[PDB]
């Protein structure tokens, strides 16, 4: 229902643009799909064989960009859909990349740290000729992180010389960008302010509910409350809390670092975790899992705005229900694009051999997301469509035009 | 399954199960978009692909198929089979298989050239004289290879060894037309010698009269073999005293087929495999020897010129009747061996005379039959299992030597 | 062109250049001709000769346009490549000079044949050009779409390389401000030259011949600074208004018609008399050779800004110098274009595009400095602006060449 | 001298498409590079190096490097094209090229010549290569020049002996290269004679020229029983109707300036050498020595063109009607280029051959070329010269067509 939603949205956008069927078919087929054998000796000496893979969906607008997932549940349709989605997302963000997605079918929880390094290095050896600073730039995803990127960078640099721009999400000490940690949450705050301004409103005074308090949710809550938003309820995997007068986010952040989660926070009451999405508020921010808003709770949402920080939190049934209630939904492909935008800035800084101060990273991020929202808004006016459809048509249109300009022979 | 021969071979060997799993997984699988402008200006998009199964023993080798019916399991099985066949042949290659999902009968010659060049552009960094050397297959031919060579050479400089099956004027090897049929004759003499016999005087039945069948008939009859019956798609003919192959060849060039040949009587095409003879050579399609006719085969030797003419049921039946079956993976390997010789000549920058091509082919197929026979003694198995056991073992030992990085 | 070698040899005289170094500077680094054969749309073969003269790379990668035009003259191509070497040095951008093209008639080729020809040409020269080797650009017969095709084909051989050509569409990495660049530079150089005479653009009365990319942008930006545009001409006719032509109003007219002809707010005039119109500043921005042995005595302008290439011939150079007319030479006056193409390459190399405000501020900085350096050479060698420009460029190339050495 | 007419006649005999013929005439690539060196006196000297790469449909290009002040572009292009046809006639997997430097080696010290050779190599190394373009000696260059090229090129690409031919034996030159052209002259003569039911043994030969080609041809022909009845060189002409003792003559010629004064032969008028009574005439010195004034009196039944262009078109017609069979130079002296192919092969294969193998392969190659040449003459009802050109043009055309023209 995320792979179905990507191809449904692409085809709806292609019809709004009047795309020729033969160009549409070209845009659907990935540039390249690669599967490689990754066999390593385990710590006990015996062999273990894994399949690594990389779908490189499109490079009309620049090098491909996308995460590397270490996860046993590999589905070819889902991986292809995610690589295709990144092609549209980078175009919406107006960063000079196409989309890719890769990974290894493995369970990292069953591998030692030494086996994970051996597997990462073998995988890099098997694909180093297929990726590259101006070809395809990987990033972390489920099951991988900054240490994984460090190993990819180190192994790749044996083959091509020191090449920090070959991956993003690196530790700061190896060329990671300042502002990366806050990037997605900060972009959520920027896009919310852009949307509210369009309705003559401002973050200050608005009441927020945030489901999820991880990298995205905690930064969004911190930065939104610093602009005067009142965060009246938050949840994570350990429980849900509420304070109608507003949760003290600095105190909550201090609580959550010392405990497993928001549960037990002194400055808020615990509440039914299944009630968080239907709490009275102005703005609802799903920032944990997808599929949480469906035909069953959609009629009970009280927010006027939904900011999709998580990927695919709303299904198509709830979209129609919420549209008819007058709820405005800022779509995920734009709302959480602060992360991929600052990953572009990381690559830029590495390419330029010179890192930026955090203020510059955040000022460029604001510039980029203001421009994307304006272009998204103009697409909606041009095609008389909602925000989700404006973002897909914007992204598809940019890729189609770059493809047409470059030609076919 | 199509893995049955491999899995049986891994058990005759003592193959560690984790190494066995590794040998099954292909080194690399690639799918690329191939989009071209058609003659009418509109776009056409195709998917090109290449399964690179194994390169422990050297560059990968395998055909390029232009055909609308792509089956991933079959492409993978054929690439894996090539890995074992090159090892049986003792040529320094692994296996690969590739193609484009397209229908060439619906594409103009200029569109086919454009598609071939775009496909080459999309894979040029994945193939190479010491990496992966393609060849013709269904839907492709020497002209296709010429276009691949020409486009590849724009990216890497002039590289004639990057494909085999090229036209002679572009570095193709002499003796390629006859190679598979000649190897069928070489392999038959090697098997017969082991039984204290020779081709001269033996009665052959040959099903199929194409590139393999006609060359085998011509060369076997020139060694004194009596070709008593032949068939093709147009009909079957018989002459108990021996068919005049030179006359039949002249007839087939002028009449589209063996049908109507003067000097042979016509027979039921469905009875050719059970004709009385010494040596049966299926050289047309696979699956023609099965559990329904196997008990009625009269030959003492079956030479598998075609790919998989005998199914496992017939193997069992024919073994207990005392019939010796020269397996396809060895018997028709003259083709892949001479394609190695083509690559060698290109690498050496100097072409061989046909006499040298044929002498080296005889040496290679004699030595490979010798090693296959020794494998059969070691493991007390038939020829087919000796061949798979030989090929898997060679790949396994090269893989173990190269290691995994510790 | 013996006129381009005349300015070079004079500059080599003024500097103390060793005669063997002078000979070296004349000889191009490389000259390449390649066969470009394509199937035509009707199936038959067509063969063209593509070429690239790479004149000098002492100061950095070579830079120069690609011309699709049937009338190829080897002398002219060499002269333009050499002139680009001095011009990049005058602008102080880290490039040398090159010039290339294909002898073909684009008006006789379909858009499909033109794409095929461009890709084949690229395949035939891809190993001879490159991001840090030689960076082509549009010229007569080519444009942004041509550069897109070169970029796309080149990238098959070397990976995505947006900095390999300049003049790209904005969507493929072209720079903001490229359209206005040459005209903006013409205006920048005019203000610098006037300030040296204690004057400002504001109030000066301009005649501009040509209303194309250079002329219309020059006319627009000069008028916004208070310049009085008293006469303008193009291929369709000439107009005059002693109080100044309303350029925003003229721009609306000229985009909806074939030209300035019929413009309300200006009276029509004889097209062949615009160059001798009473004014302070004359801006030839159309073709070359329009200032010659006979009209030199009747131009009323005290300043001539060479927006077009070589609008003044040596005979008029002699006449106007003795008449006290100041000529801002083409090699500096129109260098805004090549300077912003350098900025486009910089932005692609840096992986990050600039705002237009930054492009135009950098353009002002570069053209201010080159005018300052050019004026200093005129003092050192007691020469006119044209020789100050050539001595500045030749000297920069000579010093880089000497430092890099031989062996 | 450079009659390009043979090609056009061959293209019509083959019925070549007119657009394909035009493509075959246009060179793949023409390159001019600056070669500037410090001279021994410290000052700079600038030279122009060049390479015409005519065709590579059949494989890497092959051709000499000329150090000579008289560079003519039309001549260089014609020679590169001729090499394309000659390699095709010989059936060696090469196309044609020709290059050089405009310089006078007699005015350069050996240190300057080395510096110039290394600078030239640095300026073209990316344009040539073991599988791209393989240079060789020519006028003004020799084995030592090739050694310097090999050495400089190998700094950029690792040890690459196959990048040039004509190397000293110690750096990968082939055994049998010295005798190659003369031996090929002897092979082609025997092949031609067999077609007429004759053999070398007993035939009477007259040989003009006693250098690398003439002396080896004479030595090998007499060892096959040919009677060498008259020989000439730059010093004079000598005659012996019973046959000259070539081993004795060779020993005489190293101790003197020439065949003049040889004790085993009487001197003859040097202007009568071509009209001497014999069976086989072998011009092996200069071109143009057979023309309309001596043609009617040639006594030979066969003419073996060892030198380049010894018979002009006028004599071809005269001698054809007298029934004289002329073995054309493009084939007759191809032993040299064939053994240079064998040198490349040996270097590529990392393992040098014995002289016996070189000479056996040369016999195989030249026997086959003569058979293909003779068959072309039957197909197209033409003489030996046109059979050779149509054979070579046809091979290049067929390779070009097979490789195709898509992008
Ligand atoms: N981090 C980024 O830059 C980024 C960018 C794009 C999209 N996203 C999307 O954002 C979402 C969250 O990302 P993250 O990086 O913050 O993840 P994270 O792992 O840092 O945090 C996820 C949070 O959700 C909470 N959570 C998990 N399951 C829950 C449940 N059932 N109910 C309530 N809370 C639950 C966790 O406890 C945690 O607080 C995912 O859908 C992800 O795809 C993240
Ligand atoms: N040719 C090679 O180099 C090579 C290599 C490996 C394996 N093989 C195998 O050899 C077999 C034959 O290949 P080929 O190149 O000789 O083919 P081909 O197309 O040149 O000739 C095939 C012959 O089989 C006959 N035939 C076709 N269908 C028939 C039918 N239903 N009944 C009877 N006769 C029939 C045809 O009339 C023809 O005489 C194939 O199975 C192929 O996989 C060939
Ligand atoms: N455009 C640049 O960036 C640039 C840079 C360097 C040099 N130049 C030189 O500047 C000149 C003009 O370039 P452009 O880009 O403005 O050209 P353009 O194609 O934009 O048009 C120039 C204008 O001149 C007019 N014109 C043409 N012929 C005329 C004539 N005989 N009389 C009067 N008007 C005439 C045209 O109608 C048009 O209005 C050319 O010589 C060019 O090489 C331009
Ligand atoms: N050597 C080769 O490999 C080779 C290959 C192709 C073509 N050729 C052609 O062969 C011819 C000779 O080649 P070579 O290597 O033997 O040259 P060389 O310099 O070794 O010998 C030339 C000989 O001709 C004699 N000679 C010069 N001028 C003469 C004249 N006017 N009358 C009579 N004799 C005269 C000289 O004294 C000398 O004996 C030239 O046309 C050359 O282009 C040579
Ligand atoms: K695509
Ligand atoms: K494997
Ligand atoms: K120079
Ligand atoms: K050509």
Numbering used by the authors:
A (entry chain A): 2 to 410
B (entry chain B): 6 to 411
C (entry chain C): 4 to 410
D (entry chain D): 5 to 411
Sentences from the paper on this structure:
In the AtGDH1-NAD+ complex, five subunits are in the open conformation (χ 70.2°–73.9°). The sixth subunit is in a closed conformation, characterized by the χ angle of 49.1°. The remarkably different conformation of AtGDH1 domain II in the open and closed states is correlated with other structural features. First, the closed conformation subunit contains 2OG, the GDH reaction product, bound in the active site (see below for details). Each AtGDH1 subunit binds one molecule of the NAD+ coenzyme in a niche between domain I and domain II. In the closed subunit, the NAD cofactor is significantly more buried and, therefore, less exposed to the outer environment. The envelopment of NAD is primarily the result of the closing movement of domain II toward domain I, as the interactions of the coenzyme with domain II in the closed form are very similar to those in the open form.
GDHs release the ammonium cation from glutamate in a reversible, NAD(P)+-dependent oxidative deamination reaction that yields 2OG. We have provided detailed structural and kinetic information about the functioning of AtGDH1, one of three mitochondrial NAD+-dependent GDHs in A. thaliana. The asymmetric unit of both crystal structures is comprised of a homohexameric oligomer with non-crystallographic 32 (D3) symmetry.
